[PDB]
């Protein structure tokens, strides 16, 4: 479906990000993964992409909290691939705490990566897409880009901002063959979520899996986690021709989170 | 991808409904088509579904503006197909006029088909899906189920109603293997819209195509119509395993209509 | 102050509606109340409005589930008042049950009163307001006009429809000195809710007040009911000159219900 | 209505901010104004507030793009007022340009003032309100906090982020007697907009008032500017008891902008 396409997924050495690339490569596109982690684990994950899907899978390192590094990352990603058709701004972090106790450094970090990096990434990639007359920018927002939760001020603020940025990107390139949409996932059991599950496990002194059940129960009606593969599935769909007129909107796979 | 699945599409003898029955059949699903029109045309359409995609297709005439007739409809639809996995509530009508001049009969008519029919169809289909532990109810709302336009009170109201009903449907069956989502299309150049394109032409006394380009400009940022095939592509996606945790939400393909 | 203004409120013989009337009379406008109930209790309510606020208060009976009756209702009200500046479509009913078990008569009764009556009421009032060049149509929707809850398909669909109808009314009359907005309340402890609190109290065999605290904890972060008086305050605000440019939007008073 | 209350409004030396302080002072609340400008002009506004409405009024300068300075500012404001009941985060700036051409320094300045400043101001004031057990945090967002417009990436991103931050603030203090809401204005003819009106007057080479008339038509169906005095009345309302259960939501005064 996406043979010959060139995809770039930020923060893809693990979690949802890795699943994104895994699904894009499976669809036939050459992928550029990015993120942190042990060099070996990264290489093994990269090579596995080539072995299983027979596509060119490159790896570029870049700390996206750095504005210039992110923009350089895009140009470098384009050179390795020979172009840039699909951009997935996935990288992001979290920190829990009430507003009055939220560390300025934490607020700045979350905003820098979860919001500003989408901008810099989009800005550097748009010229390439505008020139080609085709493109796909897929921002990974969250149910938290639509509604809020306590003690997540910076995150909820960044995600909401991502949703708005997504809308602007779409309007500025409407009808140019370029679309911009935001995937808003519900709970996905990655290390980012296990941390919150573990905190609950201690605070309430309950079973680990009982805590995970509690975390789901409060926000996800299905009482089932969203899977990284499923989200990858969504990205593949947004990159299809059937989504040619889908732009500046949100794609919620949250098991009912925002229906109530 | 949908081999062995059994689908039903209301208002599918022409326009968007037909294109969605086509995409589903093309995906491997047996289908039940419905609507009005010349019998020979309807037959040729039912006939081509079976020959082109090697699936079983059936046609059942029923005026979904009637509650009981709608309930009889899916009942017979289920018997014909030998089940019911995917239900697409698509049949709808339009009527333009300011509120103080809107005909009571036109209001009742639109709420009846565009909204109540969705409820009756869903209520009759759910027991079958609930029993199986799997199901997909795809409602066709509109960008007008999220925002409004002048002189479309009954339609915007009903479309908004469908979005609410979609949410309730998803919540009641969360985790049961059943999901309910609403496709919210922007401008699709079908007869329902051509009628509005002609009203503009005869109004400003301008080219019919000049009227079409004026229709888009005012609401659809892309300045490109959404195609029936693209909507069907969306239905196929909602029906996939990737959308297992996508429920109670809206899928907008409106060329950026709702982004601004 | 609303001295000189003529206000009309449907379903105002008790509950939110009565508070709506009470706050408008207090602000200085003459009001016409409507609804069912014991004539003794109704005359008391009507009479209290008169002696407590020094305004004229009339009572007009009419089952708003009847399109014509409602249209005749606002015609008389406008006659008894000597005009019509503020209209509050408040009348509403509720039935709780899952879709597949939802009685068709209940679905029809809810749509007819909760949605259709809002359209007919508006239709008949607009010509009068359009002629004066000033008007206010305040629709009492709900948090269920924006989000959903299990077993309230007809109600949620109806309320979502009111939100849409509100947007249309507003656009069709933009700049004419007429605004239309929907107040969307969270839990308000009226006889409509008490019935739901008791069903919880009996169902789970818990204290009646413990049922109330549970009902709130599930949807209202503030853990405090919204009061009919507060909602009446909102209407008075929507009727003020400060709200001249507020139109086609929703006003949520739900203790944070929709924030999450 | 607000006699004895203590209010703080950022960016209140001119424009919407000053109108907010005015209506608050008029309502009887002591106010603290802030913002840039010539010292004599600033003193004048502070002076008129004091004598015209007979309340206390102080001016505290502070470049709110400085986290530490904004936190110190509210500490000084509370000290000057002898408490802090109402905080209105109004300060904001704009810059128009396509994403790929958007200056990074402009992106940073907008996020810092339009979004971060709201966070820091809120963080510093909550402890004070939490102690008294009563509070109002009114955030001035925009229609651009719910929808988008071309060439306003940083601004839309920021405003959406403010909408999200508002919800978190409200949720973290649900029931504590503290509410947080976001006023979402449409076009308001302040210097921030004149600049944009002039740009159209120049580009299209048309009348300055024709440009102002044209700026309205594209987004505001009422074809009327929302006035500063009206937004001030909105803030006065949000501070009233009727809004005790109104929290974590948006109050749109956009003349129908978001209705379509
Ligand atoms: N887990 C959920 O339930 C959930 C829900 C909604 C949205 N999301 C989002 O999905 C995206 C991925 O989150 P996740 O759950 O996979 O977390 P994760 O911890 O599993 O993954 C974060 C990925 O980004 C890398 N990363 C770290 N710092 C980085 C930096 N400075 N620059 C670039 N990459 C960096 C990580 O090493 C990792 O590969 C995020 O932005 C997060 O908002 C997650
Ligand atoms: N055309 C657009 O731009 C557009 C935009 C948004 C949503 N939609 C929706 O797409 C769906 C299909 O609309 P359309 O544009 O294809 O219109 P259409 O006129 O092209 O198709 C309507 C289909 O329903 C049949 N129908 C007529 N009365 C019926 C009844 N009582 N019961 C069952 N079927 C009946 C029609 O004969 C036809 O096959 C609708 O509900 C409409 O809301 C269309
Ligand atoms: N109670 C809540 O928590 C809550 C929350 C959100 C919205 N609402 C809405 O507030 C409005 C008032 O609801 P309520 O709680 O006061 O219920 P209520 O039972 O207390 O009041 C309903 C009013 O309408 C009258 N009514 C009955 N049938 C009528 C008819 N055919 N025509 C005209 N009036 C009729 C009633 O007798 C009564 O005076 C409604 O539309 C309901 O949606 C209530
Ligand atoms: N004008 C509109 O149509 C409109 C529409 C929607 C939202 N808004 C918002 O209303 C709020 C006020 O905007 P405005 O139209 O009055 O613009 P303005 O230019 O008229 O006012 C900005 C106020 O903030 C001060 N300000 C400048 N830099 C500052 C800083 N670093 N720290 C603190 N204050 C600073 C200004 O000097 C001025 O007093 C804003 O955040 C803007 O988003 C305006
Ligand atoms: Ca919600
Ligand atoms: Ca819109
Ligand atoms: Cl929460
Ligand atoms: Cl319109
Ligand atoms: Cl629920
Ligand atoms: Cl725009």
Cα separation, A43 vs A35, whole angstroms: 12
- Number of other CB atoms surrounding residue A122 within 10 Å: 25
**Alpha-carbon distance values, C102 to A156, B123, B169, C197 (Å):** 37, 8, 12, 20
Residue A178, beta-bridge partner list? A135
Cα separation, B107 vs B65, whole angstroms: 12
| Contact status of C237 with chain D (Cβ, < 8 Å) | yes
Nearest CA to A225 among A16, A70, A9, A27?
A: A16
Does the annotation list B63 as a binding residue?
Answer: yes
Exposed, middle or buried by CB within 10 Å (0-12, 13-18, 19+), for C145? buried
Report residue C100 CA to chain centroid gap: 28
Q: Which is it for the CA torsion B113, C173, D254, C138, positive or negative?
A: negative
A222 → closest Cβ in B175, B186, B225? B175
B159 to chain C: nearest residue by CA? C161
Strand spans (E) along A60-207: 86-89, 135-140, 178-185
Q: Do A148 and D248 touch (CB under 8 A)?
A: yes
What element of type H or E holds A232? helix A228-238
| Contact status of C216 with chain D (Cβ, < 8 Å) | no
Point out the annotated binding site of C: 11, 13-14, 16, 36, 63-64, 90, 155, 159, 188, 190, 260
Alpha helical stretches, state H, chain C? 15-26, 39-53, 67-81, 104-111, 117-132, 153-172, 191-203, 208-219, 228-238
CATH of domain B1-260: 3.40.50.720
Cα separation, B236 vs A236, whole angstroms: 13
The three-class DSSP label of residue C120 is: helix
- Pick the atom of ligand 4 nearest to D36's CA: 37
Identify the residue among C219, C254, C260 best suited for mutation to test binding to A, counting A beta carbons within 10 A and taking the highest.
Answer: C260
Residues of D with CB below 8 A from B149's CB? 260
Does the annotation list D239 as a binding residue?
Answer: no
Count the residues in chain B. Answer: 260
| Contact status of C253 with chain A (Cβ, < 8 Å) | no
Instruction: Chain A: give the shortest CA distance to residue B185, in Å.
Output: 9
* Kind of pairing between the strands at D86-89 and D6-9: parallel
Kindly identify the ligand whose nearest atom is closest to the C-alpha of D253: 4
Cα separation, A210 vs D140, whole angstroms: 41
Cβ atoms of A8 and A86 closer than 8 Å: yes
Residues of D with CB below 8 A from C255's CB? 174-175, 245, 247
| d(CA C260, ligand 5 centre) in Å | 5
| Method by which the model was determined | X-ray
- Pick the atom of ligand 2 nearest to B36's CA: 37
Nearest CA to D62 among D9, D115, D138?
A: D9
Nearest CA to A241 among A26, A17, A18, A27?
A: A27
Cβ atoms of A31 and A55 closer than 8 Å: yes
Q: Quick one: tokens of D151?
A: 């060439």
- In angstroms and rounded to an integer, the radius of gyration of the C-alpha atoms of chain B is 18
| Contact status of C218 with chain B (Cβ, < 8 Å) | no
Q: Tokens 């790929």 identify what position? A: D100
Cα separation, A134 vs A173, whole angstroms: 10
| Contact status of C247 with chain D (Cβ, < 8 Å) | yes
Alpha helical stretches, state H, B82-152? 104-111, 117-132
Residue A184, beta-bridge partner list? A252
Nearest CA to D161 among D124, D126, D114, D122?
A: D114
D172 → closest Cβ in A122, A150, A165? A150
Q: What 8-state DSSP symbol labels residue B66?
A: S
D168 → closest Cβ in A104, A152, A164? A152
Q: Quick one: tokens of B194?
A: 């051509």
B176 to chain A: nearest residue by CA? A222
**Is position B58 annotated as part of the catalytic site?**
no
- In angstroms and rounded to an integer, the radius of gyration of the C-alpha atoms of chain D is 18
Kindly identify the ligand whose nearest atom is closest to the C-alpha of A89: 1
Cβ atoms of A230 and B245 closer than 8 Å: yes
Cα separation, B6 vs B55, whole angstroms: 10
Pocket test for ligand 4, best of D45, D165, D192 (most atoms within 8 A of CB): D192
User: Is the C-beta atom of B94 inside 6 A of ligand 2?
Assistant: no
Cβ atoms of B110 and B95 closer than 8 Å: yes
First to last CA, chain D: 35
Q: Do C223 and D174 touch (CB under 8 A)?
A: yes
Cα separation, D214 vs C198, whole angstroms: 56
- Number of other CB atoms surrounding residue A139 within 10 Å: 25
Region of residue A37 (phi > 0: left; psi between -120 and 50: alpha; otherwise: beta): left
Phi first, then psi, for residue B256 (nearest 5°) are 90, 5
C174 to chain D: nearest residue by CA? D222
Nearest CA to C239 among C34, C23, C49?
A: C23
Cβ atoms of B92 and B14 closer than 8 Å: no
Q: Tokens 């810092």 identify what position? A: D112
**Alpha-carbon distance values, C43 to B45, B196, C6, C30, C58 (Å):** 64, 51, 19, 16, 9
User: Is the C-beta atom of C181 inside 6 A of ligand 3?
Assistant: no
Q: Do C259 and A147 touch (CB under 8 A)?
A: yes
Cα separation, C222 vs C199, whole angstroms: 22
Cβ atoms of A226 and A191 closer than 8 Å: no
Cβ atoms of A216 and A187 closer than 8 Å: yes
What element of type H or E holds C58? strand C57-59
- Number of other CB atoms surrounding residue D125 within 10 Å: 26
Instruction: Show me where the domains of chain C are located.
Output: 1-260
Pocket test for ligand 2, best of B9, B95, B192, B227 (most atoms within 8 A of CB): B192
Q: What 8-state DSSP symbol labels residue D113?
A: I
The three-class DSSP label of residue D114 is: helix
Contacts of B127 (CB under 8 A, 6+ apart): C100
- Number of other CB atoms surrounding residue D250 within 10 Å: 25
Cα separation, D236 vs B106, whole angstroms: 43
Cβ atoms of A190 and A227 closer than 8 Å: no
Cβ atoms of D175 and D133 closer than 8 Å: no
Cα separation, C235 vs A69, whole angstroms: 53
Contacts of B60 (CB under 8 A, 6+ apart): B32, B33, B34, B73, B76, B77, B80
Q: Do D248 and C241 touch (CB under 8 A)?
A: no
Instruction: Chain B: give the shortest CA distance to residue C72, in Å.
Output: 14
Q: What 8-state DSSP symbol labels residue B116?
A: I
**Alpha-carbon distance values, C191 to A250, B57, C38, C115, C187 (Å):** 39, 51, 15, 21, 12
Nearest CA to D235 among D191, D190, D182?
A: D182
Cα separation, B130 vs D185, whole angstroms: 46
- Helix, strand and coil percent figures for chain C, each rounded to 5: 55, 15, 35
| Contact status of C130 with chain D (Cβ, < 8 Å) | no
Cα separation, C215 vs C217, whole angstroms: 6
What element of type H or E holds D32? strand D30-33
Phi first, then psi, for residue D54 (nearest 5°) are 55, 45
| Contact status of A147 with chain C (Cβ, < 8 Å) | yes
User: Is the C-beta atom of B193 inside 6 A of ligand 2?
Assistant: yes
Identify the residue among D146, D259, D260 best suited for mutation to test binding to B, counting B beta carbons within 10 A and taking the highest.
Answer: D260
C178 to chain D: nearest residue by CA? D222
What element of type H or E holds D109? helix D104-111
Q: Quick one: tokens of C229?
A: 């008086």
Report residue C36 CA to chain centroid gap: 15
User: Is the C-beta atom of D185 inside 6 A of ligand 4?
Assistant: yes
Alpha helical stretches, state H, chain B? 15-26, 39-53, 67-81, 104-111, 117-132, 153-172, 191-204, 208-219, 228-238
Q: What 8-state DSSP symbol labels residue A103?
A: -
- Number of other CB atoms surrounding residue B241 within 10 Å: 11
| Contact status of A104 with chain B (Cβ, < 8 Å) | no
Cβ atoms of A237 and A1 closer than 8 Å: no
Q: Tokens 């700049």 identify what position? A: C175
């Amino acid at each position: 479906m996406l043979k010959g396409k060139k995809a770039v997924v930020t923060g893809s050495t693990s979690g949802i990000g890795l699943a994104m690339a895994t699904e894009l490569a499976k669809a036939g596109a050459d992928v550029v993964i990015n993120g942190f982690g042990q060099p070996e684990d990264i290489e093994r994950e990269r090579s596995t992409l080539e072995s299983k899907f027979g596509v060119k899978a490159y790896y570029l390192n870049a700390d996206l909290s750095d504005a210039q590094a992110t923009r350089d990352f895009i140009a470098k990603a384009a050179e390795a691939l020979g172009g840039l058709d699909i951009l997935v701004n996935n990288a992001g972090i979290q920190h829990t705490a009430p507003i009055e106790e939220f560390p300025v450094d934490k607020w700045n970090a979350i905003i820098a990566l979860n919001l500003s990096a989408v901008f810099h990434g989009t800005a550097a990639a748009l010229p390439i897409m505008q020139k080609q007359g085709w493109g796909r920018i897929i921002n990974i927002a969250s149910a938290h880009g639509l509604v809020a939760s306590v003690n997540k001020s910076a995150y909820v603020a960044a995600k909401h901002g991502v949703v708005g940025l997504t809308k602007v990107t779409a309007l500025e390139n409407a009808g140019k063959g370029i679309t911009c949409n935001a995937i808003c996932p519900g709970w996905v059991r990655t290390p980012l979520v296990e941390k919150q599950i573990e905190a609950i496990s201690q605070q309430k002194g309950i079973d680990i899996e009982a805590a995970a059940r509690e975390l789901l129960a409060e926000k996800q009606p299905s009482l089932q986690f969203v899977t990284p593969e499923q989200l990858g599935g969504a990205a593949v769909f947004l990159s299809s021709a059937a989504a040619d007129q889908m732009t500046g909107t949100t794609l919620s796979l949250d098991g009912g989170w925002t229906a109530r």
